[PDB]
A paper describes a structure:
DNA ligase IV (LigIV), one of three DNA ligases in higher eukaryotes, plays a central role in the repair of DNA double-strand breaks (DSBs) during nonhomologous end joining (NHEJ). Human DNA ligases have a conserved catalytic region consisting of a DNA-binding domain (DBD), a nucleotidyltransferase domain (NTD), and an OB-fold domain (OBD) (Tomkinson et al., 2006). A covalent AMP-lysine intermediate is formed with the catalytic lysine (K273) in motif I of LigIV (step 1) before the AMP is transferred to the 5′ phosphate of the DNA nick (step 2). Artemis is activated by the autophosphorylation of DNA-PKcs (Goodarzi et al., 2006). It has recently been found that Artemis (residues 485–495) also interacts with LigIV (Malu et al., 2012).
We also solved the structure of LigIV1–609 without Artemis485–495 at 2.84 Å resolution. After we submitted our manuscript, De Ioannes et al. reported the structure of DBD of LigIV in complex with Artemis485–495 (De Ioannes et al., 2012). Comparison of the two structures indicates very similar interactions between LigIV and Artemis (the root-mean-square deviation [rmsd] of Cα atoms of the structures is 0.975 Å calculated using LSQKAB in CCP4; Kabsch, 1976). However, the rmsd of their and our structures without Artemis is 6.88 Å, which is mainly a consequence of a difference in the conformations of α2 and the region after α10. The difference between the two studies is probably due to the presence in our structure of NTD, which stabilizes the conformation of the region after α10 via contacts with α11, the following loop and that connecting α12 and NTD. α2 interacts with this region and its conformation is likely affected by it. In the crystals, the structure of LigIV1–609 is captured in an open conformation and probably stabilized by burying a surface of area 1,104 Å2 between OBD and NTD. In nonderivative crystals, the electron density of adenosine is clearer in the catalytic pocket of LigIV1–609 molecules.
Numbering used by the authors: 8 to 57, 60 to 114, 123 to 453, 461 to 475, 478 to 603
Write the structure that this text describes.
Amino acid sequence: QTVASHVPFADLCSTLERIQKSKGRAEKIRHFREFLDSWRKFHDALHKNHVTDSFYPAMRLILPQLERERMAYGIKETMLAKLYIELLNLPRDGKDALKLLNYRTGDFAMIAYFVLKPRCLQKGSLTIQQVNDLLDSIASNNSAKRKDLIKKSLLQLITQSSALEQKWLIRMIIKDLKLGVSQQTIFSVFHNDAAELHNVTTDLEKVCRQLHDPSVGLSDISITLFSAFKPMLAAIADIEHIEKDMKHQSFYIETKLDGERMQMHKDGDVYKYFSRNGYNYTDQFGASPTEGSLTPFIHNAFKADIQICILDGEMMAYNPNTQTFMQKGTKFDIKRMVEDSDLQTCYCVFDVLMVNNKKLGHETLRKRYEILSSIFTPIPGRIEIVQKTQAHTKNEVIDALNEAIDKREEGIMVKQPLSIYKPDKRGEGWLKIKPEELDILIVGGYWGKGSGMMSHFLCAVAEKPPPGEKPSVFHTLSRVGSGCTMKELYDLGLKLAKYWKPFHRKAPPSSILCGTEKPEVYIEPCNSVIVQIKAAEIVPSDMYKTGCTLRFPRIEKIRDDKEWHECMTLDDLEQLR
Ligand SMILES: Nc1ncnc2c1ncn2[C@@H]1O[C@H](COP(=O)(O)OP(=O)(O)OP(=O)(O)O)[C@@H](O)[C@H]1O
């Protein structure tokens, strides 16, 4: 016997409707308080004699974006449209039908409601349980790729509900209630302790079950093994005011990695992995050392004394042949090459929350790092400790950021050493710093510092030729990193290899004029390629012929659609200043 099997889904939607149309935050909260309170009174009425029953059946429909039990619905609003058209017998070429089908972004539920309103007169039949039953069935049949059984499940949902129930059903499926009150507000009204508990278990059900009585608190809410906690986040930081931000004492600068944030929970032969939103990615990485794309290659990297631990880090795609991490944005397909063994998952770890019996959240950052060094012996390309150093200078933070960008990382992290780990709070001890479009030509290259492959390109601008003429002279403007973080850079290097020529300071080429800075090798401009380069500003320089250069230059794309003679010019450079 359960409450949701007794409460009409209609009661829920009335409350949702009463909430949405309310202007003030106070009136909004009030309708929900009212709903929560009747649920509670009835539960006690129901369970006097009796429990695992809880508010969850409703809570999961009220904060549907926090659903974690039920997988994706795989329902497209077009299906809904076509379905309603067939169902309601609407003229397939009329305004209603077309409004639904060609919906962009007064949302889809509103449009459906206004079509349903004069046409659907039924009162609802479903209980909150039944709706939940029906949604289960939709998610399940989506996983099975059974469209007929989704259609049929939607059918039971729709024809058994009222128009308003249908409006909210849709929002519950799209996972956007548009209520006008934050989820944090909702949790606060539900329980003093809800929000905090959810931050250490991304799980509505435990939230509701464990905090069913509003007057019983939990004494020690903490990160538990195999419970998904929300990751600690980093605050945006101004470079000019960083020393103060770090309280004028010594701090950590750590590499900022652009990958999939992931937590690993390990107890002996047993593994779980959770993403930033508390989704279970174990099947991918491996539950056991005999299964997965990662666990088997790292299981034996854990030191002898280590039975249980919890790590925080970034999953990267690593290329063994070039010893590089692959960035998110590429014309190529990371998800499939990783599967095809041209690439491999590498876990890049920057924090530990527990080891064996002890819980580390309230340890200072310094101690967790110290501990981290004793959990496993790193394996390059599978599981690494993130590169970091100790610093105290604004200049240092600048030097680190240049170095990061040159190596094609997105930025750097700055972290205060005494800081504890605060799940889902952004800032505190953790800061992130990122930099804060030219089409120019590659005219030279460098090896060393990377590998074979090139570490950097020397790039230049065109001196505007006579009319009818292609350019013949180039002025160097900037070095830039060419680490193969994307396959197109890899491909470029191989296309370009036949063209490199030794650069001689004592007898340079007439086509490329250099400043103090000299390439090891150059390339005749006609044989080369335009790169599109992102840069923060143009700053003075003696190293390059232009008398200026690019701060934080990154290559965005290779412009194979342009021609070498289409290079931006000194004059093009003038205007950018
Ligand atoms: N070394 C690290 N320590 C802590 N958090 C990190 C680290 N590296 C990456 N992150 C996480 O990644 C986020 C990166 O910031 P942002 O999204 O602006 O950069 P990005 O590289 O373009 O993004 P992505 O990392 O998703 O590609 C941060 O919020 C942080 O939570």
